[PDB]
Symmetry: C4
Subunit: 359 residues, 4 copies
Amino acid sequence: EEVTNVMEYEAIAKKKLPKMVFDYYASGAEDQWTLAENRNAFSRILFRPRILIDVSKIDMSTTVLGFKISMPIMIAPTAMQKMAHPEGEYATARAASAAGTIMTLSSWATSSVEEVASTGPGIRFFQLYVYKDRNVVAQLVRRAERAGFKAIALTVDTPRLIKNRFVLPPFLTLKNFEGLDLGKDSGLASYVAGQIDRTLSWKDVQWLQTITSLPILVKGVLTAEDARLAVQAGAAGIIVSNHGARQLDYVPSTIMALEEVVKAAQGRIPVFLDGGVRRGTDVFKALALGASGIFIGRPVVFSLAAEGEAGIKKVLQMLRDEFELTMALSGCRSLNEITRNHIVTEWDAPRAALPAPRL
Amino acid sequence: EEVTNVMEYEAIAKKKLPKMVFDYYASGAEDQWTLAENRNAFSRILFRPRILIDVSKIDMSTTVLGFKISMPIMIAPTAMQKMAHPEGEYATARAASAAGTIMTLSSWATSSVEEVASTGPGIRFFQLYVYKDRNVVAQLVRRAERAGFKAIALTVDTPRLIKNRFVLPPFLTLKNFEGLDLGKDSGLASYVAGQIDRTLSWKDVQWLQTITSLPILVKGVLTAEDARLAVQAGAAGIIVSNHGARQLDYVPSTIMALEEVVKAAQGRIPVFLDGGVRRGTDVFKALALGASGIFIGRPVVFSLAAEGEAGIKKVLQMLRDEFELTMALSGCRSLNEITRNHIVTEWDAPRAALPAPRL
Amino acid sequence: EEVTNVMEYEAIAKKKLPKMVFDYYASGAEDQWTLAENRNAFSRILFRPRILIDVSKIDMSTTVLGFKISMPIMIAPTAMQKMAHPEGEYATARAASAAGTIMTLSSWATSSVEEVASTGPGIRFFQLYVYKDRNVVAQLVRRAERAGFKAIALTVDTPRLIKNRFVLPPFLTLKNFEGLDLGKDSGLASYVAGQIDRTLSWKDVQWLQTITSLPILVKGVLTAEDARLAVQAGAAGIIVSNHGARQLDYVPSTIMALEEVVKAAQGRIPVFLDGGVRRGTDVFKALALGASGIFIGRPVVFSLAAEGEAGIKKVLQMLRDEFELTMALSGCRSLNEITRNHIVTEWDAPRAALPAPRL
Amino acid sequence: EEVTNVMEYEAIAKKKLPKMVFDYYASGAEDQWTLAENRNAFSRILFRPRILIDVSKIDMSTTVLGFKISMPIMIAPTAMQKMAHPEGEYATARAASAAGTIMTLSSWATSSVEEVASTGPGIRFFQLYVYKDRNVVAQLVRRAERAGFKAIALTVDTPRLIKNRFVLPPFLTLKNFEGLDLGKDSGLASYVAGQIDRTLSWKDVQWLQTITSLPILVKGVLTAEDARLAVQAGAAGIIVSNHGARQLDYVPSTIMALEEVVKAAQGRIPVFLDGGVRRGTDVFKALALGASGIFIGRPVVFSLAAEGEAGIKKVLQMLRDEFELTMALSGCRSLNEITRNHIVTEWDAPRAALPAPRL
């Protein structure tokens, strides 16, 4: 057999895993997400290649929050990875480290921040929800600090807004909550589901900064308005993400938003994209729209379920290889050379209609 | 079994009812309407959600013509409801009352204004056609006044512009006409079909105001021009509605018109939408376009035919629940917060192309 | 059985007629035309109806070149109609007369101008090609003058630019050429096919005016440029027509052109549309775009083949009835009331985006 | 049997040839190309025909780099043509000569420049890659000069960016490299695949001009920017071409680029189009967009495989015949008359919306 693309792991994982486990990842906690996310939007962006530029050597390295990484391609959090494969987050952490990139560990990981750190050196971010008990937030942040984690990826939605639920077997737990002072008991899983705060505002983002000095990334910004508020709130970065609620027919376009968000941020902080990135051409398109990098979630868990650590390694290498080739075809020798003029979007004014210069 | 959406009652009603009865409601008196009304247009409007706004408590209450109601979702007139279910308009009136909203009673109801009122307290509107005999109009208006009705919903078309006709059985009549002085006889049904006035102009809207002090709602306005004329004619509100004539290939877009009509009305009077509202996301989209509320017709009759009063109650609760969730996902805590900037339409100038501020 | 629409005669004629005869009419001399002409374009024009206008009495009468007719719907030339039905042009002439409209007689009719005139009073136009022998043109024009014909419909293409050919049986001929001085013989059919002039320019349109005082209509104008040249050349009217060459993938849009042509003509002369008009809504749309009337070709021959004179009568009555209803639904009491603001086209600036007045 | 169009040879060649040989030509060295290239884009350009212009005599002759040719239709290089038919490039050269047009000989031809020249008089161009060994470039250029070739068609990509490979049989070689000094051996095929230079820049285009006085054509320009750089680099012409990489989902539009490139070039040098030209209407559309001519590649090899020299002759004659007819239908008597106003593109401002003149 031979796996040739990132989306081909999706079938192998469907087979390998119990239906509910696969659906939980493919479609999220509820059945709200689509697997075809952004595939149409990405399709409708075309390239404007430059020729006769020496691209024999492509540099795709970049810096994220001061940390040098090998490619603008990072790993998004997906919860309880030991459900997907016995090695779980351990495998994700090792592959990320080996590929020279960043892993974000889920708040709901089946492995703790220090377990992840025990695997060796690597730059890691930690997913945080603001829980109702602010002292519990405090304990999570401190544990992640001690484990050497570099940034907070703040998720700002509620996963409560069902059919895709399963139980963690007794041998597996939500390890980041294990051992923490929770105060004055229907199980640990129920606690972390019940205690997500429904009243979150920007004031809470500012509060986070009184308990930690770690850079905070705010996930979910889809508008110029919230991009400005993120900057003013002291966010170190923005993640443009929103998987949608398909049963409600609630679709927001992240891609259309990406450029708007980037422009609003005014170069103050980096802007990342998370959602349906599957091709090297997708990565290129997001960066040309002005994103500083992207995150992939589903492809990592699927390839973990399919081949463990070796599969994650392979997904990252395929994405990487297509990205390099895309840059080469475009005439771009580094990330800096990936300009807005290397793509064309449906909302671009047609260049063929414009008068050409020469006075 | 389990009904999960508003449009799922449509199948149960098809089964339960004789073909002609169902077609009469699904497609109107003639075969001119489409059941897929506005579904495509609504599909092509996307959301612009705001984050980090406390939406734990959503207020969706509003005021319509001075009357407080629990949600911007009201019931449209559908004729002779005892054909759909033995309790007919009685069931519709009770469910509307219980849900804390407004019912509009059809001019052609199988139950009179006072029967409807006998069921208890509730804000109700009455559908009026201007009949050729102006004294008959006078009697209908006075009966509705006496029964405690609050507003006239003036229908301005002729339902004469066939294959979907049935007879009312002998035990059922057009109760609003029963007992009235009709003057100097081929049946009551033929009278109310024959005596609709074909010469109606704005002068007739002004005439209505000499016989009644009730606020008049003008149904059918699809243009800036007629929105201005409605205001100048003394209308208390506008209903943007037009089910189309599909066999003639006569399609007008109500949705495109909604925003135009609202803008033309200049905030003077409320603008409502009637036509193919089925989802909480539809309700949200109409309000963001500037409508003050919406009416649903078909879903009410269908759920009446399927489950009686309990079905209407259920349709209203489903629409309501999806609406709240839509507002929550959008970052809107009240109706006032549902601004034009919370949606994006195909005719909107692309924000991603605009230069972002910061001088 | 029951025929309900204009395009339903198309099947009956397919059955009734030999394949080659039907194809010749459906697809033209060669296989170049499409039967679906303009159906998509017409589909993408929507209505902007006005309400509360008294439309109980619709006047659709108009004047064409000084001649009063009952409706802006006229008959286009289709050749050798005795192939389609034994009564041929005689039947077309009588039905046109009875409906109170204009018939254009084909240059290639199986019945002469005076035969057509022998059927009784009626306003008729004659199709002319400029033949290489200018003296033959002279004879055709004079015969048509003598027969009481009112205008020249000048066709300016060459039908030579095959698989859809048949022979006229011996009892049928090209009657307009019969008896004329042709000078110094492979048959009459070959003569009229061979002697169409390939060198036609606007100078030839001006030449026509030295041999006749009849108003000349120029068929085929698809651009602002040729509309201006038609006016300057002394044309009394323009017919916007071009059936396309589908095998060559040579598509020009007449509909998009219609408005452009009308605007260029600056109200100097009337503009007509010929090509795929089948619905009352089509007629309305062409007039709102600024055409003074339309011609129908295929539907006339088909209904002739299907039911003779009675079928043509029926096609005209169906088109007429749908047109009236379309005007009624639009709030238009006469042709004068059919303004550009009663439709919306894909190239119209969206009114919903504009700011509404009230200073 | 009867071949009626250019794309009908595609099936006959599929049958006649081994799968790998056909795929290599249909889809290129790798499987990256699409056979449907530009077919959709060309479809969405419509005509604006002019009438009453004498087109009985169409002149389609033109001048390319000072050389008079019979039509703006030239032959693109396709490698190793003896794989497609025993006579190979000999057949292509003779048919081009007979049709009075230009052939470009592939760098990878199974026949040398002097063999091609031995067939008789004809204007020919030679495809060049810049190889790592600049002295080998020197030898190729000199051999082509001596053989009477008129221009360099510089290919600037690398065909290395697999499944569609075959071996040349022992009796066939890459004849342009045969006998040349290659210096200090795994076969000739491996040498010419391995020694393509990956570091090419505009400096190399300028270097070409120090070793030859032949006009250089630069293939691959897709942007205003590279069109300007081609002019400044001393290029004698630009070929707008890019077959895409479909497996990578890497699509650039050549057609949209064509007009932009032409405008940027400011009339300094000719602009040609290569890629999916199959119809006379395609040729017309490219010229109206401002191209000076086009090249066809696939249709030539296919018709060679199907009927040898007689097939190429036939492809050229079909393209030619449709082109003439297209010009005739458009009202264009020469290439000069093919203006930008004879087509309409999706990016054109709608003329129907503009106000017509007459002050």
